[PDB]
Write a protein that binds this DNA or RNA. Sequence first.
DNA 1: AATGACTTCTCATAAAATTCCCGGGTA
DNA 2: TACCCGGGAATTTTATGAGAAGTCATTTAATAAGGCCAC
RNA 3: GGGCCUUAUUAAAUGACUUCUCGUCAAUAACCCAUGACGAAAGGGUUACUGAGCAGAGCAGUGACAUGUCAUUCGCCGCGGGGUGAUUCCAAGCUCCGCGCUCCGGCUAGACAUGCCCAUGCUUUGGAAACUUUAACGGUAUGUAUACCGGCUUACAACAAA
Length: 603
Amino acid sequence: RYVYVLDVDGKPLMPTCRFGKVRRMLKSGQAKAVDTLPFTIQLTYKPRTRILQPVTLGQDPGRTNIGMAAVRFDGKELGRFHCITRNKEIPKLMADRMAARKASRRGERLARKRLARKLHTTAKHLNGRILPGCSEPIAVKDIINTESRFNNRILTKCKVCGKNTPLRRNVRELLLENIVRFLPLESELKETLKRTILEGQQGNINKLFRKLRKVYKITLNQKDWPGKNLTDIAKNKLPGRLPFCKEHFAENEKFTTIEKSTFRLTPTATQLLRTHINLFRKLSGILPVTDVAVELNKFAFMQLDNPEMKKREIDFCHGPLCGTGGLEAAVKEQQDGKCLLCGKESIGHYHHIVPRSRRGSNTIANIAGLCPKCHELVHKDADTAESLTEMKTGLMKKYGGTSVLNQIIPKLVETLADLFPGHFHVTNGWNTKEFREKHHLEKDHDVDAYCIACSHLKPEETLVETEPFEILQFRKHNRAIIHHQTERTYKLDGVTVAKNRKKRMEQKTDSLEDWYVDMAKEHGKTQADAMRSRLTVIKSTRYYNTPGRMMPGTVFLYEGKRYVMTGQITNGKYYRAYGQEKRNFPAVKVRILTKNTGLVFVA
DNA sequence: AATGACTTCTCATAAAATTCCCGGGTA
DNA sequence: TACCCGGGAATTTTATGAGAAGTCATTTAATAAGGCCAC
RNA sequence: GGGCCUUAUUAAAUGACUUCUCGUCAAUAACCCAUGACGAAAGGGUUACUGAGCAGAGCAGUGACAUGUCAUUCGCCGCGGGGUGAUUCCAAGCUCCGCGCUCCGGCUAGACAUGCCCAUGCUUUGGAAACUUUAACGGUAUGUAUACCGGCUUACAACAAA
Ligand SMILES: [Mg+2]
Ligand SMILES: [Mg+2]
Ligand SMILES: [Mg+2]
Ligand SMILES: [Mg+2]
Ligand SMILES: [Zn+2]
Ligand SMILES: [Zn+2]
């Protein structure tokens, strides 16, 4: 591995191979050891020359695995890095934030309800309510509601004004007009075509289509352009909102002259976009980086799901939901409208077969329609649960990770083109493959990153040389006061017999109700009561996080060796460390070097 | 005139339980 | 000179919240047609 | 022919509001059972009533329910200004008050009358900065650590070792 050299200003200089001179300099005060991983030194003097070659920093993007490589202008590797990200956690941490926020608001509602019962201010005969955008009721009970705010929540705004833009359900005429606009038809026939489609008169639509098909030869069929798109705009609802206001949706060319993209991403995609940019900034702290190189990744998911089939024999336009009316309607058609386990009652709940808490997919392969009675048993009884899996197997999330990668790449390219003007370069995955094969390299992230840096360059030799560095990523915040909560465990003779008084929703193990019923079968009531009356109980106990504690990714010294903290034990008395298994490092025997830098180097 | 590749997948932590250590009464 | 208990400090082991309903939104990719600018 | 915009269909993801439920935690009462420290403490349930809602606490600040009758008056939207997150910086997300119809949504919600109460918002998300006393890697001698050596530039190139 090279030694990374810093100037007396703190700015990078070119790396050194001269391991002997580095130890002669450290023995003689000509340098200081700023870091042990990556091993980095700062000069205490200013050299007689200050000449640096161009250094290109290349990246192999990924959700979990990001590759980096530093390549000098002549093609020589100056370092290779593999970063393992934290991005897997964020959807689950957001889904816990979900459950906790809604449970807190349910508690404030329950406090109002219990006060209304005491004062007789509960709603008379209220059995749910229908809101303006809905068709079925919300099942509201004792007090009318709290305002529900879903109809607008503006996020798209007009790309040429900042004004708002209409819903596709209301401006159906403008959407329909911007298709009819371009046709060979006379203006009175364009008016007649729009009006006849907007009236929805199936027979008179066919009369007009047959007339215009004879006179003008235009392909007016409900399965061909334009007639398909015109027929689809006759729907009662259409999804989402326009990119332009009514004043500007009338005109096509504005992308040539004026734009404001008004961009958004989820927390999960935002953290990964930040991670890609922050790896360039971190490695620019140890190398004199002049240029940046990246790989475009672009995934079509129904090709990843059909990899043996060739690209133009895939029905991208159709899939499992085309014209079905959405997921819940497609399942209702697929089941003849009945509950899957018993074929008598109608569908009540759309059941995720692999649960949402257990990495289950939201796609139609993971859904079964059940009545509320069976949906409760499938959560509380393992024999009914296995019986459902024989009818439909279900799926975990196949493509969660690469969907987040697929979202980021366009914004990553724009951001790096702004950060490195005239010094930013792009590749496609097949170029990385060609280079890897041409030079007898083998596939991994840091090697692909070397191939990506070499797209810009003309390497004199294409050798790959160093032991690559490993970077972990750690959380910068954790706001949770409760760390975990125990279940109400019941013990007899010190042995666990049950875990709640009656079953929790997912509880496949016994409650006291389950255990007592089986003891009363085996021993009769008098003995089962003599066993209830002998139970020992630990109440459901909340365990609390220490505020202001050391976070994971903290670097520390113990017995003269560098360690990276992976977690605390016993109110912060002991630290766990990377690669050291269950070993407990005492916090008194430890010096902290740096608090968590987010991206952190490991052995 | 097409399309190639690529990527992905189990814990930190508190506090309860268990062990170990020094000071002591006793012989 | 020497050993078995106790109480406090130190260290290790144990255990970990779920399901659904009425609606909405944003991003990326592909496919189709249109269009602007394009030897 | 390629870039970029827009519409339709689809695929794969992950964000917001509202509403239901199992289970929890606290306490009282009746009932079933276990049990007797030195006649009575200590113990487990079941059913009912009541309270709780990071078993809550911060920082903000007046509303929260109910009935009447008028209804698109309102508002999730525009402009302005605040709360919280939230402090080392700052972001996401939620939210409140004034004025308003340019745009976007709409019996959401608002107004007025009467009754009763404390019944408001946000808080389990994401980066970055800061710290610093961070002697690494290879070969040789010996009893794994102290010692000694890996030419010259921070670096390329040339030169020098060989
Ligand atoms: Mg790649
Ligand atoms: Mg209260
Ligand atoms: Mg379910
Ligand atoms: Mg890769
Ligand atoms: Zn406009
Ligand atoms: Zn059933």
